[PDB]
């Protein structure tokens, strides 16, 4: 029932390297999620 | 350009769909039964 | 809750579900108001 969010912002295809993603938010939702979509700014 | 994401099972008012965005002001999170549009975006 | 929840004609304020599609995953909720497929023929909006 959690929604963990891990984030990492790195100054810069995918680069060849290593970067650990620090946890950001533990979001207490407790619902079913099976599909998603992103949003853009036009 | 990428401002946020939409999560859910049916993405309508029947179920509760997760909504995460980040506008020019601050990050807001809502957990509601949004009736999402077919082609949602920001302008 | 007999003192607080008891109506002589039947306390209908609380509702309970019987015919679910399948066993739900723990810690999830369904708000569907559609007629359950209680057989072989599709319901197609027909109840009874």
From Swiss-Prot, chain B:
This is Spike protein S1. Attaches the virion to the cell membrane by interacting with host receptor, initiating the infection. The major receptor is host ACE2. When S2/S2' has been cleaved, binding to the receptor triggers direct fusion at the cell membrane. When S2/S2' has not been cleaved, binding to the receptor results in internalization of the virus by endocytosis using host TFRC and GRM2 and leading to fusion of the virion membrane with the host endosomal membrane. Alternatively, may use NRP1/NRP2 and integrin as entry receptors. The gene is S. Binds to host ACE2. RBD also interacts with the N-linked glycan on 'Asn-90' of ACE2. Cleavage of S generates a polybasic C-terminal sequence on S1 that binds to host Neuropilin-1 (NRP1) and Neuropilin-2 (NRP2) receptors. Interacts with host integrin alpha-5/beta-1 (ITGA5:ITGB1) and with ACE2 in complex with integrin alpha-5/beta-1 (ITGA5:ITGB1). May interact via cytoplasmic c-terminus with M protein. May interact (via N-terminus) with host bilirubin and biliverdin, thereby preventing antibody binding to the SARS-CoV-2 spike NTD via an allosteric mechanism. Glycans are attached at residue 23.
